Structure 1
Amino acid sequence: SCSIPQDLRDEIKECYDVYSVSSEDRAPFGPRNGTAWIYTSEKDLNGSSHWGIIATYSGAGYYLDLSRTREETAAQVASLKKNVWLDRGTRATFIDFSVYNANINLFCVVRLLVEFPATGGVIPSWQFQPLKLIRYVTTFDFFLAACEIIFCFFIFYYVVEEILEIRIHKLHYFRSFWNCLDVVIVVLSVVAIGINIYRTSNVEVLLQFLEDQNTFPNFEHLAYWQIQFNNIAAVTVFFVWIKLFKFINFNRTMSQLSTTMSRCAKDLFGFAIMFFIIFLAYAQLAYLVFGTQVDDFSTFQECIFTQFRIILGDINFAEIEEANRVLGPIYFTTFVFFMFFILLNMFAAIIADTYSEVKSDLAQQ
């Protein structure tokens, strides 16, 4: 699948490239007995992508459904092991199943992934997800259904009473931060309602499995939309709670504590850009220098999070100098000095100064 340099082609017999949809095998190999030696497409596997660690794998490949009792599943696994099924050309392996636990009403789908990078090695990953597909059983579920129809009514009211404040009232005034936020909540709630309707509008895979209980239950799709819906329903609550600041002005001492922030949010924004430019300047330098032999700087995001953890005084530099000695301790010392004693303070001083003047800007009045 890749190109062998002609100079040493007498030694390199063959190569296997990294995983890619344009370089994925599609031909039978070994004994062509069953479905474990024949490429089955994604469309007739009812699969989907996964977005693993090394890359994003498709839903096709060579699969096999194990048996229902141990003494024959072990025989199938032994048969797979004997006729070599994991050659060097293999790049990913998935094992998945699901359980019910009928005491409470809560399914649980399990997927385990093993990745074989082209540079050798093994990278494991796991995912357990507690789905629930038979919701409407207990009276509490009826109560939850009532409370979510109520939520739909509330979001309808909030969207209509916010549209009413655009063309029937103030035209095109957004720079208030209390209407720019009131739109984010509505949009996120609409998205979360659409996702929830789409998720529970098709549970046909459960019906198909319940028809015949000797096949593989393909619950993989629901376990993804459940995560995608929890990721949205958890951010909406955060902004709803943040919206409470709109109403805390009940006395003459809560008003100046907010005026201070409202008047120092213009000066802090200017310094934030200057701070984060040098922050990224350190981050990229660390990524380029140490990002090959540490693993704390292996990727750019990890480099950023490592510096954020340096600010907390969490990480120990016991291994930084091992990757490089000229730039090993120098980087740490200069970073700490310049961003923990000269640049991290300006965020404090400014605020303090602002507060002072604000107090005067009231006391004189």
Structure 2
Amino acid sequence: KYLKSVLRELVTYLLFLIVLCILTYGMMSSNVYYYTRMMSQLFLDTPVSKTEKTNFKTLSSMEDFWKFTEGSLLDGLYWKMQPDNRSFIFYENLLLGVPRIRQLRVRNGSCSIPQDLRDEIKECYDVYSVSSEDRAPFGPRNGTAWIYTSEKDLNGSSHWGIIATYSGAGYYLDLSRTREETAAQVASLKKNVWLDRGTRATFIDFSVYNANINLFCVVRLLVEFPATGGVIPSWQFQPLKLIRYVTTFDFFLAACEIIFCFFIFYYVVEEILEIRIHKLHYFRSFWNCLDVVIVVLSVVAIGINIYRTSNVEVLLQFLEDQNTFPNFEHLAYWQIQFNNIAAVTVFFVWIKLFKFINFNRTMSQLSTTMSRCAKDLFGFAIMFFIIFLAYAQLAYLVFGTQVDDFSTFQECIFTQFRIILGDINFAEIEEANRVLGPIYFTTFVFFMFFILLNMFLAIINDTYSEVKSDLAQQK
């Protein structure tokens, strides 16, 4: 009967489970996590390396930021001491091409006008807008240095980042694997007094490769100067398996690889017919979209993965191998996006067992009610969220004052979780203003943390304590 029907497809759920797992398990062995950090903090948490404390992760001063140029990543991304040309990485990994420096810039004399201080100020700079977007050829002129290029002139898109979240390319440079002039560039950038005053965001980005497990990784770096005059740096990192081709073990992963694409293809159409079979039948059912969420999810990876990847990998052999540098980013961006959703699927992919693990017993029948009576969870979720946002908002306004954790308003929505959990650096909140707001801190941790608790749990308890009688009303 159905025990033949479902377990058969359940077998498909069983085996194909390991398949994508095998891919993830195969494409990524456990050590890949190390391969991030071990390959990271050789740059990030490495100091400025003057025999001075501060790292990249803490940078402040403008000119200090060239002490990042000279003495951090420059000598960070390295040339090796062994003794035609042949350049590896710390004897392990593999460099390719050479980074592509980007930046931003805006029209001078744009905005920020004091009316009567025009004495003191001849010109000013406002924030980086959708209208900022302005292109200064003005020298000192060596070639590129002043050359604007649109980001359609370049190939990939821009970067997202926290505050902006924009697209544009102010200037550009392709770096030099030669350690000689890559500093003399900067020295010629002294000759240019470099590229920045009111510069918002500086991009120096590239990507590289380990030889051993052949895996590939991207270096995307973000240094924001918000228009108020500050310096906020950050990072971006993604690993990559560049070609699904493996010179050795591909046909182990390529074994099941071209297999599943028609496997799920069977899953594709079968419920599509069930869409017009059941239209409102899955409305209000709440067992519906989740099952078919994967459908959208799956194809997204499926469709555009090989579509983009198998395309450009070719020239990646060529535009790379010459000292010139191929942009892999936008491609990688997809891999990221790929990696992202593919994982996000894995959950729902995984939890496909969650419905499968229990057909067994009263156990299986009771969780049906669990969320079915959890409808209330949605009811007072809001009053929390508001009151949650409330303090957060209030926090924003109140604590827009000096404090971290706060007042990039989104982050205040997290730091409003982070507290009820813990870890808070509280010496700052109080020392903001000795009345203000620590009462807040008291209020919230009083109110929320006392009001929030059981309004979960009772509704968890009651109907569940009700499911006992409600499982007693079958007996």
For the criterion TM > 0.5, the same-fold answer is yes
Contact 1:322 1:328 survives alignment (8 Å) = no
Q: Distance in 2 between matches of 1:119 and 1:279?
A: 29
Kindly provide the CA deviation profile for residues 110-160 of structure 1, in whole angstroms up to 9, marking residues without a partner as x.
Answer: 232322222213222222333332331345322323323332223222232
Q: Secondary structure at the match of 1:85?
A: coil
**How many Å separate the matches in 1 of 2:308 and 2:280?**
37
How far did 1:213 drift?
A: 0.7
| Change beyond 3 A, Cα 1:146–1:177 | farther
From the superposition, tell whether residues 97 and 158 of structure 1 become closer, same or farther in structure 2 (CA, over 3 Å).
Answer: closer
2:309–2:331 CA contact under 8 A, matched in 1: no
Give 1:264's aligned residue: 373
What whole-Å deviation, never above 9, does each CA across 1:162-191 have from its counterpart, x for those lacking one?
123333467643322222211101111111
Q: Is the 8 A contact 1:32 1:38 kept in 2?
A: no
Q: What is the distance in 1 between the residues matched to 2:250 and 2:390?
A: 53
| 1:304-327 deviation digits (Å, cap 9, x = unpaired) | 111211221331422112223334
Shift of residue 66, structure 1, vs aligned partner? 3.0
Mapped to 2, the partners of 1:195 and 1:103 lie a distance apart of 28
Deviation of the 1:289 alpha carbon: 0.8
Residue 349 of structure 1: how far off its partner (Å): 1.9
Q: Is the 8 A contact 2:319 2:326 kept in 1?
A: no
Q: Does 1:20 align with 2:129?
A: yes
Q: Distance in 2 between matches of 1:90 and 1:167?
A: 55
- After superposition, give the CA deviation of every residue in 1:81-106 in whole Å (9 maximum; x if it has no partner): 13322342333322233333333312
Task: Pick closer, same or farther for the CA change 1:113–1:250 going to 2, 3 Å.
Answer: closer
CA distance in 2, matches of 1:41, 1:101: 32
Asked if structure 2 preserves the Cα contact closer than 8 Å seen for 1:111 and 1:126, the reply is: yes
Cα distance in 1 for partners of 2:466, 2:166 equals: 58
Q: How far, CA to CA, are the matches of 1:298 and 1:347 in structure 2?
A: 28
Q: 1:98 to 1:309 in 2, by over 3 A?
A: closer
Which is further off, 259-268 or 31-40?
Answer: 259-268
1:8-59 residue CA offsets vs partner (Å, 9 max, x unmatched): 1111121122223533342322232321122233333324211233313434
The DSSP-based 3-state class of the residue aligned with 2:233 is strand
Distance 1:67 1:251 in 2: 64
Distance 1:214 1:125, change over 3 A: same
Aligned partner of 1:275 in structure 2 is 384
State the percentage of identical aligned residues.
Answer: 99
For residues 290-339 of structure 1, give each alpha carbon's deviation from its aligned partner in whole angstroms, at most 9, with x where no partner exists: 12321222222211111211221331422112223334221111112222
| 1:244-287 deviation per Cα after TM superposition (whole angstroms, max 9, x unaligned) | 23234444331354144044212332232333232222221111
Partner secondary structure for residue 221 of structure 2: strand
CA spacing shift, 1:73–1:277, aligned 2, 3 Å: closer
Change (3 A) 1:162 1:88: same
The residue aligned with 1:166 is 275
Change (3 A) 1:8 1:67: same
Computed over aligned residues only, the root mean square deviation of the Cα atoms, in angstroms, reads 2.5
Conservation of the 8 A alpha-carbon contact between 2:374 and 2:460: no
The offset of 1:345, in angstroms, is 1.1
SS at match of 1:13: coil
Q: How many residues matched?
A: 365
User: Which has the higher mean CA deviation after the structures are superposed, 96-105 or 192-201?
Assistant: 96-105
Q: Is the CA contact 1:92–1:115 (under 8 Å) kept in the aligned structure 2?
A: yes
Asked if structure 1 preserves the Cα contact closer than 8 Å seen for 2:243 and 2:313, the reply is no
Whether 1:115 and 2:224 are equivalent positions in the alignment is yes
1:198-217 CA-partner distances (Å, limit 9, x unpaired): 32242157347357512122
- Contact persistence 2:203–2:223 (CA under 8 A): yes
User: TM-score normalised to the size of structure 2?
Assistant: 0.70
Higher relative contact order structure (alpha carbons within 8 Å, sequence separation ≥ 6): 2
CA contact (8 A) 1:290 1:324 kept: no
Distance of aligned partners of 1:147 and 1:15 in 2 relative to their CA distance in 1, 3 Å threshold: same
Q: Distance in 1 between matches of 2:455 and 2:444?
A: 16
Indicate how the Cα distance of structure 1 residues 360 and 181 shifts in structure 2: closer, same or farther if over 3 A, else same. Answer: same
Q: In 2 relative to 1, CA 73–275 (structure 1 residues): closer, same or farther, beyond 3 Å?
A: closer
1:269–1:292: structure 2 CA closer, same or farther, 3 Å change rule? same
CA–CA separation in structure 2 for the residues paired with 1:99 and 1:70 = 17
Q: Is the 8 A contact 1:296 1:302 kept in 2?
A: yes
1:117–1:263: structure 2 CA closer, same or farther, 3 Å change rule? closer
State how far apart, in whole Å, the 1-side matches of 2:215 and 2:413 are: 38
Task: Compute the displacement of 1:354 (Å).
Answer: 1.8
Unaligned runs of 5+ in 2: 1-109
Contact preservation (8 Å) 1:178, 1:246: no
TM-score, length of structure 1 as denominator length:
0.89
Which runs of structure 2 are paired with 1:71-82 in the superposition (5 Å)?
A: 71-82=180-191
Q: 1-side partners of 2:451 and 2:278: how far apart?
A: 48
Residue matched to 1:155: 264
Shift of 1:69: 1.8
